[PDB]
Amino acid sequence: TRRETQL
Amino acid sequence: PFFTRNPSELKGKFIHTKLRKSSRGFGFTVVGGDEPDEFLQIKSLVLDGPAALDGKMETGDVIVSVNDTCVLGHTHAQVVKIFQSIPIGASVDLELCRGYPLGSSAYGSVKAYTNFDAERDALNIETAIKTKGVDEVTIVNILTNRSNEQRQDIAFAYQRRTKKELASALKSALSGHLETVILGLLKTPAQYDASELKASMKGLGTDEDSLIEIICSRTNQELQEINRVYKEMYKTDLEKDIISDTSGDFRKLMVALAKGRRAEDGSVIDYELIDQDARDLYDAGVKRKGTDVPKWISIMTERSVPHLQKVFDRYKSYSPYDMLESIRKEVKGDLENAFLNLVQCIQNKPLYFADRLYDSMKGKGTRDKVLIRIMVSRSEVDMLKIRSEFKRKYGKSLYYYIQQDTKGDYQKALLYLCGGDD
Ligand SMILES: [Ca+2]
Ligand SMILES: [Ca+2]
Ligand SMILES: [Ca+2]
Ligand SMILES: [Ca+2]
Ligand SMILES: [Ca+2]
Ligand SMILES: [Ca+2]
Numbered sequence: 001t002r003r004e005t006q007l
Numbered sequence: 008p009f010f011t012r013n014p015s016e017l018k019g020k021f022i023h024t025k026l027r028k029s030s031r032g033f034g035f036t037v038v039g040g041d042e043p044d045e046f047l048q049i050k051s052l053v054l055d056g057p058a059a060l061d062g063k064m065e066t067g068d069v070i071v072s073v074n075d076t077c078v079l080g081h082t083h084a085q086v087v088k089i090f091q092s093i094p095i096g097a098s099v100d101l102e103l104c105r106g107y108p109l110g111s112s113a114y115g116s117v118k119a120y121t122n123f124d125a126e127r128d129a130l131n132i133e134t135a136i137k138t139k140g141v142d143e144v145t146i147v148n149i150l151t152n153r154s155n156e157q158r159q160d161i162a163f164a165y166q167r168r169t170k171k172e173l174a175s176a177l178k179s180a181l182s183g184h185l186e187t188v189i190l191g192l193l194k195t196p197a198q199y200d201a202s203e204l205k206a207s208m209k210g211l212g213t214d215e216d217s218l219i220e221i222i223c224s225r226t227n228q229e230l231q232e233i234n235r236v237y238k239e240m241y242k243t244d245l246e247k248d249i250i251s252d253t254s255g256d257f258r259k260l261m262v263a264l265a266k267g268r269r270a271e272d273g274s275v276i277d278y279e280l281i282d283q284d285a286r287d288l289y290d291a292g293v294k295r296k297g298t299d300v301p302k303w304i305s306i307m308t309e310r311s312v313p314h315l316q317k318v319f320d321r322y323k324s325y326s327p328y329d330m331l332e333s334i335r336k337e338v339k340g341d342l343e344n345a346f347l348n349l350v351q352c353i354q355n356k357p358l359y360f361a362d363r364l365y366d367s368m369k370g371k372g373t374r375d376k377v378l379i380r381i382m383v384s385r386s387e388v389d390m391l392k393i394r395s396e397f398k399r400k401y402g403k404s405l406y407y408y409i410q411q412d413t414k415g416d417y418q419k420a421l422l423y424l425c426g427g428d429d
Binding site (some may be wrong): 002003004005006007 | 035036038091
């Protein structure tokens with residue numbers, strides 16, 4: 001469970 | 008955890024692609040770049056959006072440079088600010104590096120091929136299929152050194168070059184156990200599990216052992232994909248098929264386990280609940296004459312595996328038998344076999360599979376269905392842990408036993424999945 005960011 | 012901030016020290020493939028920022032961004036998710044020496048790779052793509060429509064970008068690719076600026080070793084928030092500052096309609100150039108998998112179990116034996124070439128492998132496979140006498144060595148040397156994802160792309164490249172599905176082709180060229188190994192490798196983890204499940208329920212009699220192994224050892228995440236893919240292929244809910252071929256309390260246990268709704272690993276240890284579950288398991292079985300079975304099924308299916316590991320230790324403070332020995336005395340039949348397999352997977356799942364591999368080979372002949380299924384289903388999961396527990400218990404390596412019990416290309420095919428001696 002790692003941090004994601006939508007680009 | 009290999010990382011570098013020099014591009015000349017990367018050893019994957021380099022892809023250059025240009026993207027135009029849409030109203031909904033570039034349409035991809037990035038992950039990584041959080042713990043000092045960490046890469047930035049592509050989590051997912053948006054099918055509707057620009058990144059996927061360009062096609063050049065694949066998931067698990069490492070972002071090398073973003074518009075002439077090398078971002079190797081830049082923080083997650085530093086390079087996010089780059090893409091977000093791009094205005095709608097503006098274009099970005101991305102240099103991408105592939106060969107470094109996004110997700111991969113640290114204890115699997117087969118690893119993704121770095122210099123992967125799905126088109127070349129499909130061409131080399133068709134070369135070995137068409138060879139007079141069939142070159143089984145090449146097909147084995149290829150498919151056992153590629154990850155399951157890489158095998159899903161080779162099956163795509165083979166159909167795109169032959170109009171013939173690679174499964175049907177290799178089925179006609181291979182025979183015996185070697186065919187069973189290769190056909191199972193060409194299925195996704197959910198596909199192979201869903202197929203071996205239905206296969207265990209052909210005819211009135213069922214292979215309760217094969218049914219017990221898969222349902223007791225798979226995690227919630229794995230069971231969600233199994234229940235989805237099972238209806239996808241066999242046009243029926245897996246639960247439904249389970250109610251049909253099973254019955255009794257054994258049916259309750261399989262349906263509950265197969266639902267894949269076990270509680271996730273609790274953030275805090277429930278010492279108070281560990282004692283309660285341990286006493287409840289004691290109250291519901293060995294303390295009294297008789298067995299409150301649903302209490303066992305409820306606790307052993309609804310608690311997280313780390314929790315249940317600690318209740319089985321705490322349970323020894325109430326009962327003169329451990330959880331294993333208590334199962335043999337309080338219950339019998341397929342329910343007994345199911346409970347024994349279940350707590351083995353909870354206590355030590357790699358040791359569980361190591362013991363199963365030993366049983367399949369210790370006597371006269373081989374239980375090839377069990378040996379092949381474990382080597383296929385655990386190759387990218389915990390095969391190293393299985394091999395580790397195996398040699399500690401039995402003195403010799405799992406490699407050594409596959410070598411004695413099996414022969415031919417089939418032997419070599421399983422030895423590759425094992426991944427060396429111990
Ligand atoms: Ca041959
Ligand atoms: Ca055949
Ligand atoms: Ca049946
Ligand atoms: Ca009793
Ligand atoms: Ca819990
Ligand atoms: Ca044997």
